[PDB]
Structures are given as C-alpha cells and as structure tokens.
Amino acid sequence: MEVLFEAKVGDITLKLAQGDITQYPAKAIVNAANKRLEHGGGVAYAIAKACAGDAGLYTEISKKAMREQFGRDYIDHGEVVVTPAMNLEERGIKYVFHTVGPICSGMWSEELKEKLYKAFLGPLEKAEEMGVESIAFPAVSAGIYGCDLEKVVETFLEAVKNFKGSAVKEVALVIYDRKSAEVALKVFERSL
Ligand SMILES: Nc1ncnc2c1ncn2[C@@H]1O[C@H](COP(=O)(O)OP(=O)(O)O)[C@@H](O)[C@H]1O
C-alpha cells in the first residue's frame, strides 16, 4: 500500500494511494457494487472474498442487508447499503459501504456524472450519519462500467469538496493498478 498524495480538504485529510482497498487503514471501505449487490467481479469480488472468505456468501449477506435497509432487491445511485467487514474487522475495517455507480460504457454526460457524484457522496454522508471518521473509496465505475478514470477522479474530488460533515476526518481514494494510479495522481495535483 503506497500513499501517493495527501492534502487537506476543508477539515478533512484527503489521501490518494495505490493498492488493495481491502488492506487500507480505514474504518469503512466503499464497494463499487452493481444495483443488485451481486459481487461477481472487480473490487466487489475482492471485497466480498476478503470479508467473508467466499464472495458468494457476502453476496447473500449484502442482499439481506439491502432488503432490510430498503425493502427491495436493488438500490439506486446515492443509496448506501451497510454490511459488517467481518474478516476485515481485525484489520480495523469495521464496515463496507456498498454504493452503485453508473454504467458509462465509454460515454460521458451530465446525467452519468450526476449519478457517479451521488454514488460518491452517498457513502460520505453515510459515514457522517454513522460517526465513522475514516473512509476509503475505490474508483467507482472506472472498471467494468467503463467511465473515464480521469472523469471518475474529478467527480470523486467534487464530492469530497462539496461534502459537509464533522465526523469524517479522513478520506482516501485507493487505486489498484500503477498505470491508473499515476493518472489519478495527475488529477489530484492539478485539482489541488
Ligand atoms: N482489490 C481492489 N482494491 C482497490 N481497487 C480495486 C480492486 N480490484 C479492482 N479495483 C479497481 O476498482 C475499479 C472499479 O472497477 P469494478 O470493480 O469492475 O467496478 P465498476 O463496476 O464500478 O467499474 C477499477 O478501476 C478496478 O481496477
């Protein structure tokens, strides 16, 4: 796990790091899940596997929590389903905030952007609402959902800046591959 950047955003300490989010020193980690919380691949799989030891198991636990927290088998952009980090609790990660970003498929518009923004802000406010002081995010929609990485990071930062809370003291963006990390770093530098 390598921290590539660290700046102050309001009263929050924002960090950019390269590595596996399931190993980040945060109380809550965000999962870039699909509307059904079916963790079949991407970071969702990694997180599901690291929490329950078996992705299929966490997929079921997530569906239950969602049904319990919303009354349906799906969530909308902005809505966050909370589930215990289980096996990750011994690392300091207590919860997993499940959020759903848009499916860009290589496109970009104000509509897609607004959905990704909600997908990023939702977890922050959920962290505020719960009193969690530290939270780490993955590059929501930058993988399978094909949203431009640079656009993703810009949107993530816009959310972090517009966010208004007192409990959240630390926020991080964790990027898996080095190539993408450098791209994210450039955005962080020119935005701050
Ligand atoms: N273990 C992991 N930790 C942090 N980021 C990860 C991990 N595995 C994948 N990622 C990154 O998370 C981003 C989200 O992609 P993906 O998981 O398919 O979800 P989405 O459907 O939102 O695109 C990608 O940029 C991917 O490289």
Ligand SMILES: [Mg+2]
């Ligand atoms: Mg959509």
